[PDB]
Amino acid sequence: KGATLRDVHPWRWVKICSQHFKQEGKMMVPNCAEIVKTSHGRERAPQNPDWYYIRCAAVLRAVYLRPGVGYGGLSKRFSSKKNRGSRPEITTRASKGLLHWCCKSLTKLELLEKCKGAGHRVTKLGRKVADTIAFKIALRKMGAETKAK
Amino acid sequence: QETQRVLVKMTSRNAKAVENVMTELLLHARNEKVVLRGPVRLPTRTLKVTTRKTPCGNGTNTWDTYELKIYKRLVELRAPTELVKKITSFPIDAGVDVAITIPH
Amino acid sequence: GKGSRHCVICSNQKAVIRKYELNVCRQCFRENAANIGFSKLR
Amino acid sequence: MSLTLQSESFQHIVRLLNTNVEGKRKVPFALRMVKGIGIRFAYMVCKKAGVDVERRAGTLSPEELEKISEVIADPAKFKIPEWFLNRQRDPKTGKTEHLTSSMVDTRLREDLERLRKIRAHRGVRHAYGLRVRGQHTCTSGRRGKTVGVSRTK
Amino acid sequence: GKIRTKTVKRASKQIVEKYFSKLNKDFYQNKRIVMDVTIARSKKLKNKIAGYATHIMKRLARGPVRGISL
Amino acid sequence: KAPKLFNKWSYENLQTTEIALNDYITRTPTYVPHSAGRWQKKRFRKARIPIVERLTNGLMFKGRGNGKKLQAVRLVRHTLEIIHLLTDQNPIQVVIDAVSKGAPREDSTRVGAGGVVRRQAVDVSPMRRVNEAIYLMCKGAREAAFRNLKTLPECLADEIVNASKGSSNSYAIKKKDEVERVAKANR
Amino acid sequence: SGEKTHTLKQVQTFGKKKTAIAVATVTKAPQCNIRINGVPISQILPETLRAKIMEAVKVVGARYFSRLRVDVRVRGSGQVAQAYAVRQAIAKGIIAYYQKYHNEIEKAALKDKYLEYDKFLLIADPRRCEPKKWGRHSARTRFTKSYR
Amino acid sequence: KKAAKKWSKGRTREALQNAVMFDKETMDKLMKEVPKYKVITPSIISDRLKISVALAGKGLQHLCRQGLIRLVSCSSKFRVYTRAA
Amino acid sequence: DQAQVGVIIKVLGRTGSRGNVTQVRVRLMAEEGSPEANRTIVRNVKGPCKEGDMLSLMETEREARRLR
RNA sequence: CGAGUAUUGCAAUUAUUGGUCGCGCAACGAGGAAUGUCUCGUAGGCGCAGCUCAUCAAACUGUGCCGAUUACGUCCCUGCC
RNA sequence: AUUCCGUCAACGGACGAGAUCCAAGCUGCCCAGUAGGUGCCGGGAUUGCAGUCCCUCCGGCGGGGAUUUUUUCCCCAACGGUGGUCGUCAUCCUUCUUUUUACAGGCCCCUUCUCUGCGGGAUUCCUUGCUUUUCGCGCAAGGUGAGAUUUUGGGCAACAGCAGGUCUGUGAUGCUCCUCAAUGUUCUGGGCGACACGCGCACUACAAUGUCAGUGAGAACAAGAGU
């Protein structure tokens, strides 16, 4: 058989699935937001304006895999380290409003589901669609072999 | 029978004393209706203490560390409760906490 | 912060090792490791 | 990068809205300019007006400038938020302000002298010339060596 | 220093001395032997004894090595 | 099938272009370097590592902030690739050669008595030479890329580029020369 | 209970190397692949380690090698140390399957060839990250001596 | 620099002509230099001082999506080029 | 160029007082103007290496004794 | 560093700490004469436990992740038997 | 190695050094489990058709064509096996079901990775290499060899010695002070944290070797609910 989300590079795929939520106009930003700090760790923040999709892509990436991943988990996958100043070189802070948005939105997108009203785990449909997407992107590469085999 | 998963959990200030405990009770309890699936032992917990020694004022401000590892042994039995209680008539020493629990 | 410990061996804020509900002076701790069971690790 | 051959978009270095704007820049810190103190990029205000790397500071379009000038001084008119707003409770308006320019200077003088004027150790510590902490305060002042020095004799 | 200590040498010796002959030149049984003909303390020490016992025999095997006999 | 350098170069269709250096260098044909393996504290061990592994460590350190052995190998693969496209040469045919040129065969020895500093002619070991060579090549490379972004991707390549030529234009060959000169200077 | 084109039989090994631990399964059924993180290895894409682990098949030919599937799952940094662990487990998988599913001369060759290009099938890079030296709070080194 | 210090005991480095800009010569040159070398790298563009290896490399990508130079690694970043045939 | 290639034949040992130098007996491969081999020279090396190994002899007849 | 919000504490007013957004081009482009430590998954970097702890460490005491020259000698120097 | 031989006006002993001990690395159980370990256990599909499947690609026995006609090359049958164009030493889905309340495969089940208790194992054992002495106590290199060296990191550790330091523990204290219009004690409030500067450690930056925006399926080791 084939290549699902378990088998596929988001480097092409999230970059496309981001677009699945974009291109289609399914969910986008919430009313409360659209500015976006990196999270409490940084000003410079999303050069990619698509961060929330990307986020959604990634919360979704989480949710099929770690079925039942709560709010607090999303804070952690968020990661980073901080050079504070003439001070320690120590790990960073995840902004929860938006985390919580992402959670609200992918479930509204019906790709996420609040498993046991909590930690999210995927919609069936999500992952078939993901695998579908995976194949479409996969084949036509700007690398080496096989659009001509 | 209507077994009881008995968990007799034995945590001890050394591994030493408790194994002695563990074994003998089980031997005693067993013989015969006490039926046990072999003893599993949960992580030895360790207590660390480093101290600033010396009241060097002057001389080396060097520091020394004592430790107490605490050893956990568990055996589970699918056994009779009254029999358990019949064998449970051991006054047992210290340094060996032994807990007995009846879940399933 | 240094005024609420009052070492239960010694009433002391200073000299007392602050560790795991204990309140003994550093010396007192050095004296006690055996009955308690702490043996050198390093 | 583009294959554009242009000289009038290779642009520079212009002082606008009582600021300075250099050429080049990913765009941000040209916009960051004028200090004394936070003057008022917000990053966000300017980024929110529709400015970017796709022009850099170096592209330097007039059009843009007008749009910035417009967005900046009523930042939360542009909904560009007020929860950050370098000044938020004045004390003579008692309020909010995206403070700009020399009026921040003005604001600096007035407020710093009073803030300083009602005195206290803490007060003087930021005021006369110290880092407002460091316990062992003398060590700080490193190679600026002369905090100011004072004697009343 | 892969000097067989005095205590060692004495012991490896001594075991042939009280427990004549037998052995091997093999450490392995001579090892077992060390366990078996003494009531010694640390393994290392037995093995070391053993290694030498193998040794001492190995040159006894070719002689009545300096100071030694049966 | 002697492993081929990054997928893309045979080594057993190269050899050391030196008349003496040739042995010491370890040079098993590969696809990648570094792995675990305690050489260090004995003179012998150092040998088994081939040339490229030495390279794999060799590009960097920082006061605080390094360890990134990982990196070095990818970029290097890229400079070499280019270099192959730049000189047409196999990077074996580049390194081997570079080595063969950049390795000084006589150096000056310090034999000091009571703090007084005299020196004598010491004939550089083939192993010492490899050690030297590697050390040297990269040192110069590292030199440019450094300070004001002369670009490690640009510089390293440019160094080795000059090393297989044996160019003057390389801090490496500068030192290599200096040392042979200097030993001949010392006496 | 499965049955995969009427299949017959597995063996299991683990690799740990430093902190890092991977666990491996070898078994036969009706063609050719060998899968990492759910998908065939000629097809798995971290180059980083992948390219580190293949070389005996890859420089020389895979037919001697890709003879069976090994399905593998991972937890462990020591990322590399994990790699070396994986291979080791793999090696272990090969032989155990082979003791039973072949005979010695192939079991011995496979091994021989393996050992011959071995990245530490049977050894430990014994540590990762050292017990401090207290006082100095370090591993060999030392708070400066300030001399005087 | 504006900095009073910010410079060591021995180190010295001179300036390049690479920039953000848009220039007739640059663009046109780029078209004639991007063929020119047998291997074409972003770095060599930088080295011919008109445009640095960064955006010049983009110049190479956006000449190489026009095929002018052949993108080698089967991916991005540390791709490189050779002149096209 | 005078590479004269002589094989380090013997590591004679370490002299000097830095632990750095080693005296070595080298047996020439061919020595210009003589039957190849069987011409012995002592050169004194710098560390890393061993006997059997091939030095590209620069001051070839200049044999080395004392490193003091 | 400036308003601005949250938290500690009886009390911070010798800013307890955070937070926020602005905001900086301080010094500082890697540091002289000098100079400190160091020879194996380790130097070393890199990070994290663990406690001081109302509240607060760059400390403390660990943990990890990553990951190496030649030295292996020499006994000079500098020092101990 | 105060480690041994050996020599030897000592002889004999002792504590140190050995040595020990904790911790450390290898361990089809050689210890016993896991209802806080790991496994066929469910039920259903296989994702550019050039693939799972098939076999001149090769060779044996052949034929045609081209050919320097020599197993020269192409095409090609049968045969066999390689070979063949991504994939089925088997891939996927659906998690089978399903739970009177944050759970939602299967299990006859299967012990193997998991804690942690037992217990192994290296001896320079061996080979070879220094024919040392005549013998040697030894030593190197190489081997078996997870693991080779006083194996690992410690812990322990002699004897004297140092008005060190130790009034900042001490409910160890001389001698020696106050004892309440005390410097006790509480309380309050302060301070030790005050900046010309001289230092000692640390920490950080100065930077593409970097910075930024984002993206990465990375576990140590080890915490916590007092009466």
Which domains, and CATH codes, for chain B?
Answer: 4-102 (3.30.70.600)
- DSSP3 helix / strand / coil % (chain E, rounded to 5): 60, 0, 40
Residue D107's H or E segment, with its range, is helix D101-117
Using a CB cutoff of 8 Å and minimum separation of 24, what contacts does D85-92 make? D86/D37, D86/D38, D86/D40
Residues ≥6 apart with Cβ < 8 Å to C26: B51, B52, B53, C15, C16, C17
Q: Which residue is nearest to nucleotide J5 (CA to C1')?
A: D83
Note if the bond before B32 is cis, omega within 30 degrees.
yes
Which is it for strands B63-79 and B36-40: parallel, antiparallel or unpaired? antiparallel
Residue H45's H or E segment, with its range, is helix H42-47
Find tokens 């990250």 and name the residue. Answer: G129
Cβ distance F11 to F27 under 8 Å?
Answer: yes
A144 touches chain H (CB under 8 A): yes
Residue list for the binding site of A: 83, 85
> Does any strand J atom come closer than 7 Å to the Cβ of G132?
yes
Cβ distance G107 to G98 under 8 Å?
Answer: yes
Residue type, G128: R
* Phi, psi (rounded to 5 degrees) for D87: -115, 135
- DSSP bridge pairs for I6: I28, I55
Written as six digits, the tokens of B82 are 């009254």
Q: What is the distance of C-alpha F152 from the center of its chain?
A: 16
What CA–CA distance (Å, rounded) separates C25 from D34? 59
> Does any strand J atom come closer than 7 Å to the Cβ of F74?
no
Cβ distance F76 to F92 under 8 Å?
Answer: no
- Our separate counts of H helices and E strands in chain F read 6, 2
Contact D48 A43 (CB under 8 A): no
- DSSP bridge pairs for I12: none
- For residue F1, give the 3-state DSSP assignment: coil
Strand J nucleotides within a 7 Å radius of protein CB atoms: 1-5, 11-15, 17, 19-32, 35-48, 50-78
What CA–CA distance (Å, rounded) separates F72 from F156? 11
Distance C41 CA to K160 C1' (A): 30
Written as six digits, the tokens of D129 are 């010339």
Cβ distance I23 to I15 under 8 Å?
Answer: yes
Contact F81 H53 (CB under 8 A): no
Total Cβ atoms within 10 A of residue B17: 17
- DSSP bridge pairs for A112: A122
Contact H27 D58 (CB under 8 A): no
What CA–CA distance (Å, rounded) separates G103 from G101? 7
Q: Which of H20, H51, H63 to mutate to test the interface with D (most CBs of D within 10 A)?
A: H20
Contact A6 G45 (CB under 8 A): no
Which 17-56 residues of chain H touch chain A by CB within 8 A?
none
Total Cβ atoms within 10 A of residue G100: 11
Between CA B45 and CA B53, with CA B48 as vertex, the angle to 5 degrees is 165
Nucleotide nearest to A138 (CA to C1'): K48
Give the closest-approach CA distance of A26 to chain G in angstroms. Answer: 31
Residue G88's alpha-carbon distances to B100, D135, G20, G109, in angstroms, are: 43, 56, 13, 16
> Does any strand K atom come closer than 7 Å to the Cβ of D149?
yes
Cβ distance A37 to A80 under 8 Å?
Answer: no
- For residue I14, give the 3-state DSSP assignment: strand
Do G and A have ≥3 inter-chain CB pairs under 8 A? Answer: yes
Residue G141's alpha-carbon distances to B25, F37, G129, G135, G144, in angstroms, are: 52, 22, 14, 10, 9
Question: CA-nearest residue of chain G to B63?
Answer: G135
Written as six digits, the tokens of D30 are 């040209």
- DSSP bridge pairs for E30: none
> Does any strand J atom come closer than 7 Å to the Cβ of D141?
no
Give the closest-approach CA distance of C15 to chain B in angstroms. Answer: 10
What CA–CA distance (Å, rounded) separates B51 from H60? 64
Find tokens 């590209």 and name the residue. Answer: I56
Cβ distance D86 to D99 under 8 Å?
Answer: yes
Query: What length does chain H have?
Result: 85
- For residue A65, give the 3-state DSSP assignment: helix
> Does any strand K atom come closer than 7 Å to the Cβ of G43?
yes
Checking phi first, is residue I58 left (phi over 0); if not, alpha (psi -120 to 50) or beta?
Answer: alpha
- Beta strand residue intervals within chain B, DSSP E: 4-12, 36-40, 45-52, 63-79, 96-101
G134 touches chain B (CB under 8 A): yes
> Does any strand K atom come closer than 7 Å to the Cβ of G135?
no
D10 touches chain H (CB under 8 A): yes
* Phi, psi (rounded to 5 degrees) for A24: -85, -25
* Phi, psi (rounded to 5 degrees) for A135: -60, -40
Written as six digits, the tokens of D140 are 């700080």
Between CA H19 and CA H26, with CA H21 as vertex, the angle to 5 degrees is 85
What CA–CA distance (Å, rounded) separates H46 from H43? 5
Between CA F132 and CA F139, with CA F136 as vertex, the angle to 5 degrees is 145
- DSSP3 helix / strand / coil % (chain C, rounded to 5): 25, 15, 60
> Does any strand K atom come closer than 7 Å to the Cβ of E28?
yes
The DSSP secondary-structure symbol of D129 reads I
The DSSP secondary-structure symbol of G68 reads S
Written as six digits, the tokens of G50 are 């992948």
Question: CA-nearest residue of chain D to H31?
Answer: D3
Residue D130's H or E segment, with its range, is none
Find tokens 């445009």 and name the residue. Answer: H51
Distance A91 CA to J48 C1' (A): 9
Query: What length does chain D have?
Result: 153
What CA–CA distance (Å, rounded) separates F4 from H46? 31
What CA–CA distance (Å, rounded) separates F110 from D123? 63
Contact D6 H30 (CB under 8 A): no
- Beta strand residue intervals within chain G, DSSP E: 10-17, 20-27, 35-36, 39-40, 69-75
Positions 23-42 in C, CB within 7 angstroms of strand J: 42
What CA–CA distance (Å, rounded) separates B85 from B94? 20
> Does any strand J atom come closer than 7 Å to the Cβ of G131?
yes
Cβ distance F121 to I59 under 8 Å?
Answer: yes
Residue type, D141: G
Note if the bond before H44 is cis, omega within 30 degrees.
no
Which positions in chain F touch G60 (Cβ < 8 Å)?
1
